[PDB]
Swiss-Prot record, chain A:
Belongs to the ATPase alpha/beta chains family. F-type ATPases have 2 components, CF(1) - the catalytic core - and CF(0) - the membrane proton channel. CF(1) has five subunits: alpha(3), beta(3), gamma(1), delta(1), epsilon(1). CF(0) has four main subunits: a(1), b(1), b'(1) and c(9-12). This is ATP synthase subunit beta. The lineage of its organism: Bacteria, Bacillati, Chloroflexota, Chloroflexia, Chloroflexales. Coiled coil: none annotated. It comes from Chloroflexus aurantiacus (strain ATCC 29366 / DSM 635 / J-10-fl).
Curated annotation (Swiss-Prot), chain B:
This is ATP synthase gamma chain. Produces ATP from ADP in the presence of a proton gradient across the membrane. The gamma chain is believed to be important in regulating ATPase activity and the flow of protons through the CF(0) complex. The gene is atpG. F-type ATPases have 2 components, CF(1) - the catalytic core - and CF(0) - the membrane proton channel. CF(1) has five subunits: alpha(3), beta(3), gamma(1), delta(1), epsilon(1). CF(0) has three main subunits: a, b and c. Belongs to the ATPase gamma chain family. It is found in: Cell membrane. It comes from the Bacteria. The chain holds residues 50 to 97 of 290 of the full protein.
Amino acid sequence: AEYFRDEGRDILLFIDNIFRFVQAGSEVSSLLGRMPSQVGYQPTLGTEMGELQERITSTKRGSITSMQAVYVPADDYTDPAPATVFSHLDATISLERSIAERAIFPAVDPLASTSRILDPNIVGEEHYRVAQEVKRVLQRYKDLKDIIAILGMEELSDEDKLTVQRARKIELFFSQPFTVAQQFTGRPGKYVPVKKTVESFARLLNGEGDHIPESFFYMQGDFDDVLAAYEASQ
Amino acid sequence: REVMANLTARVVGAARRGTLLEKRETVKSVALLVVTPDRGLCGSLVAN
């Protein structure tokens, strides 16, 4: 890919499971007689990650739009390999086991997922405000998770209650059918433009859609599709 | 309960059916009474 980057061509780079590169390095180091570090990993983990990752850079001659994948052993985000990857990225997306087990196929945790270009000067003031609100909600929800689990929705205040069902609706609404998911799911795929996503979430946060039950936000497109489904079910 | 049944049966005339028992026509103002626990933690009872 560096040949195409060096001559100016825009390159999309998809490296899958950098963690397997780390694991291969670990096995090679174990066979090489190097002293193990942390959980059996190679002592030269950081340097190997630097040597691979620092080559994945958009330079003044060309741009590389990298998109990697990282596999966390078990479900440990404190593992040395993902911990080393985290500091070599611009946009971090965290997939959680619990979200997937809740049938939310994207399974992305908004609280643990950040990005560098989530700045109003780059992505847009409305986009930034919407994202910040969608995180402050679900942050209130993560704070009240234990309260809800042991006592229930009733003990919360009225505004806290409203934020809680808004958070649950948002969590359901982040789910989206994928065109590559037709092989095991019959739901047709949807492509929601970023403008439509921002508008839908702004409308949802305003108060629109409060009357709609949470089950109607599951695996839908923009807010218009949710409203159409609600009208269809009356 | 039976004293009401025994008494209100005797008093049937609309002219004498005044004061509290008067079934007013063209209702305009309605007052309601709500009783709620003084303390929370009751569950959905207060919300209900």
